[PDB]
Structure formats: C-alpha cells, structure tokens
Amino acid sequence: HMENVDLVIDLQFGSTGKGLIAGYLAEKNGYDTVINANMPNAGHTYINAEGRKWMHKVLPNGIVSPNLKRVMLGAGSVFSINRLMEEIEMSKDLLHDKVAILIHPMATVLDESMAAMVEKLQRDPTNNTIVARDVAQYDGRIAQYVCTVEEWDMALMASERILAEGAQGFSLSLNQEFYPYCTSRDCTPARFLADMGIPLPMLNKVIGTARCHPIRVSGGHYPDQEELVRRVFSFSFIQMQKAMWTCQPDEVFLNFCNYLSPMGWQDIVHQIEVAAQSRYCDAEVKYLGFGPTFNDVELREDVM
Amino acid sequence: HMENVDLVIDLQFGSTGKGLIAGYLAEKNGYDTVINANMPNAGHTYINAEGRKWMHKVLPNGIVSPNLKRVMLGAGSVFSINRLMEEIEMSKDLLHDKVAILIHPMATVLDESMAAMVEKLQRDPTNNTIVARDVAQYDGRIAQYVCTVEEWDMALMASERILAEGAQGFSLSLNQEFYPYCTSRDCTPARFLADMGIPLPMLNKVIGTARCHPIRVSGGHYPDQEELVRRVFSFSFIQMQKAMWTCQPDEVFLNFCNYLSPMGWQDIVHQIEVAAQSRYCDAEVKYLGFGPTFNDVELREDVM
C-alpha cells in the first residue's frame, strides 16, 4: 500500500537521461504501475538490451516493465493527445488489454504549454476544453483513458509497485535560483508526487539522476561550473549539493560516464557522494550510465 | 536535520480552523521555524490562552511559538507586501531582533492572485515586478526579509523544529474532483512541502484538520453530504476518505466540535478514524476544537 513508489528525479538541468534509468528500473523491478506528470518536453529515451528505442514525451519510460498493469499520466501532465496516441500506438504490444492507461481527469490537454497550464489555472467554468475530464467528453481518443479522481486514487491504491517518473531537472525548478530561466514548476520530489497525486507515505525511494557534464537546453549556471541550443557544463558540486538538499535521493544514477576518463566520472561519483553527505543525504551513486542502453547501466559497486 | 517538520493541513473545504491548531502546536512544541506558502485568503485565526488574536493571511499562525527563530514565507507564497507589513507590525513583539523573517526569493508579490501566480509562471525575463527577489530590488519593505534560495535552504537546514502550515483545504485542490470550482493548486502535503521548498525527509508528521460540519466559502460537494457566501455541509465520510488517502495525516484535529452534541462530534471522531483506516491511514483524532482559542483545544483521549 505505502512505501512502494520509486521516484526517478533529475538532479541537474534535465538532460541526465532519466528515461534510461526509468526503463532500466522498470525492467529490473517490474512495476505494475508507471506514472509521470510530464509537461511538453524534448522527450525521454529508453533503449532496451534488444536495441528497441522508446522516445517518450508523454508516456512513462517505465511502460517497458514486464509486469505493466497501469500507465498513469498525472494531474500535472500537460500533453498533446496526438503525441499520446502516437506513443500508445508505438507501444501497442506493451499496452495490451491487461494494461490500463489512466489519464488523470485534471491533466491538461494541449491544443493541437504555458497557455495550456495557465488556462487550467484560470479555472474558467465555461472552458470545457482544457482538462482531460472535459476534453474526454467530445474527444473519444482520451475518453477510454480518462479516469475520475477516485479511479486515479484507486489505481494508486491497487498498485503493488510504482515507478514515478519526475520531469525535467532540479535546476530547471521554477523556485530554484535561475528564475525566470526555469520551467513553470519545481522539479523536486514533493512537486512530482503532488503532480501525480501520489500521497507522501507511498514514497519508497528517490532515484536521483545526474550527468557528469550537466546540459542545459540562455539560463544561467552554477559558479563552480563553466560551459565546455545545448550548453554542456562541467560538473557543479554546488548544483549537486542543492539538488541533494532538496531532492534527497536515496540512490543516484550517474549517467554519461562514458564521455569521461575513469578518473573523470569516478571523481564525480565521489563528488556527488560528498555533496549528498554535505546536505544530510545518505544518497549513494548506485547506477552508472555508460551509454544510452539498458546494457550500459552498470552497478557502481561492480565498476569502482 | 530530517523528520522535524510538522505540517498542518486541512482535510476538507479550508475553513477547519488550521490557524487554531497551528498556534496551539506552536505554543506546545515551540518550533524555532514556522513556514507556509499562503496565496491570498480570508485569513487564519489563532487565539492564545490570554485572548490575544492573530488573524493571518500571510504570516504563519505558528509565530506565537515561544522559541520562534525563523518565519518563512515559501516560494509558493502569493502575498501583498501591505498585508505582510501590517501582520509584522501587529506581531512586532514576537518578531524581534532574534526572529528572522525570510521571504523566499521566488515568492509572488501581489500588485497593490490569479494574475500574480500566472505572471510568475509566465517567467517574463523583463518582468522584475512579480517575484520577491525582484520586488526587493526597488521595495525596501521586503528587501530586509527576501533571502536567496541558498539562504532559504540553509534556514530550513538550521531549523531544529518546523511548523509548516498548509493552505486552504484538501477538497479545494486544483486536481480534486471539484475542478474548476477549486483553488489554483493542490492542497495536499506533497504540494505544501513543494511550495515551501521542504525536502520530503524533513517531514516528521502531518496534522490533518477537520470540522464536523465542513464549510465552503458555488463549488459542489460530496454525495454523502448535504448543505445545512458560506455553505455549511454535514460531515462527508467520502470527503474524509479522499482527504485521508491523499493527505495521510498522522494526527487529526477535529474542530468545531462545540457546534455538535457529544454523540454528533464523537460519531465524526469515529467516522474520521474509519475513513483513515479505510484509506491505509493510521491517523487518529488527537485534538478536538471546542472553540476558537488555545484553551478550547482538547486532547481527544481526555474528552472521549
């Protein structure tokens, strides 16, 4: 019932490859429920051992789970039905009769991002075209997926193990120091759980994802980092401390280690752990990303 | 460092008298830090044993704490500087030199609510008049209180015991079934902690507040409840189950018991506990509100 939510969060600028560890964790743990509350994004990629690629902007990367029973798009979701239908059709095989795709009634339906989220907040009683409950009344494409709040809560209750997939990245948080060069929401576990309607006691663990060289999609960076519309930055220990403090991951996935010398990514493994420790976070780098595929995720304990 | 946040949340329509239990808990526990992220509201009232009244729309009711060291207005705060200054001046004595009032740099400054929250989300790089960091550059009134995100995190880190004061009420949640007849955000612990930038491991306990007869400030109600711009409703067990499920309070403050026969409020005590139990919530009604004052808060175990 409780402590059954593994929440994958990004500790930096949103391009740490959350999608990779989400897919990897889904395959390893076999979550019956996968959940997110994605707003429009460049996509989240997952590549399995067999080389099958999933580039999801809407659907959780966790849909690869062998025990997939429920696919849940949170209240905080801001999605294009077109994109959603495209992703469902592309994973048709994984989204069979025994897989329930639940769109939260209050998920924001994108017309044909900011204007959509704002229109939802406007709470215009006449506007029956912004939330999924309302759009589902004339758009049959989502009606089959759009559940009630009660059904949403009931789907979470009936979920054995849940993979929650946080969006963007911690430093892109609306209320982090880079404002207004940030996203429209906090990219913190508290906000993700809020946007997916996940009650706090359901949180099992936070899987924090990092890149050795964090990348920004023109935004502003941390003082202990420098540039190396993509802007590659050197690792920021301060970014990590801040991400550690707020996000408090239990486990860290350090990705794009393949782009650095052993000393390079190993130093960042140690830096992340120092940052975690410095911010009362028992987080340990457990997973290492050495490529975009399931096969490239290494247990940190096996490689260092 | 962690498990030091007592978060007072409202389980119904926002008029359960959260302010009363916040003030009561502040006096009993002596939190050095009191925190909220209030958007414009009708106010939160606290009356001490001596009869002193605090009607706060901006400041936490917890400022009454004998050990008050920090007063924190979260990133999610949407406040009038005028209202803030008025409340500070009225509690001047409680807000001495040894009390730091910290306004999150990303708190929304109300011009002279919806338009303010929206302007903040717009993230217009030219707009230096919406967030507290920016408004503090020309408005000295808040400059003295407006901290940096780092100082905000550092204030939470250095806090021994924190009273977090949730806003409005669970059924007023943006993503609860009453949408669009709801507030602009979820009124859930996850969202409150998100809006106050409180990392999830800092959560000690959730104090859920309820009224025997929930009141709506014209909105819609639960099917197991009926009406008895204020709309008084009979207790909704379904409302409680839903609030229990999401909010998962550890302790329940059942207020306005004074307006009901012993059997009336006692039945609701039992109903709340049944609702909690039915939704995997070990919540117990610990406090009973028999009036608007500190003296009127009773330990449930002492009266039934």
Ligand SMILES: Nc1ncnc2c1ncn2[C@@H]1O[C@H](COP(=O)(O)OP(=O)(O)O)[C@@H](O)[C@H]1O
């Ligand atoms: N360690 C890695 N080395 C190289 N490419 C990788 C690695 N991890 C992921 N990728 C690729 O990097 C890109 C960005 O990752 P993606 O999942 O889309 O972003 P995010 O999940 O951070 O939003 C994808 O095309 C993905 O396949």
Ligand SMILES: Nc1ncnc2c1ncn2[C@@H]1O[C@H](COP(=O)(O)OP(=O)(O)O)[C@@H](O)[C@H]1O
């Ligand atoms: N048990 C009670 N009986 C009578 N009046 C009460 C009781 N508890 C609180 N009040 C009063 O009810 C009003 C509403 O409470 P208030 O704290 O302002 O709302 P909330 O905290 O729910 O936003 C206040 O004027 C308060 O003094």
Ligand SMILES: [Cl-]
């Ligand atoms: Cl686990």
Ligand SMILES: [Cl-]
């Ligand atoms: Cl306690």
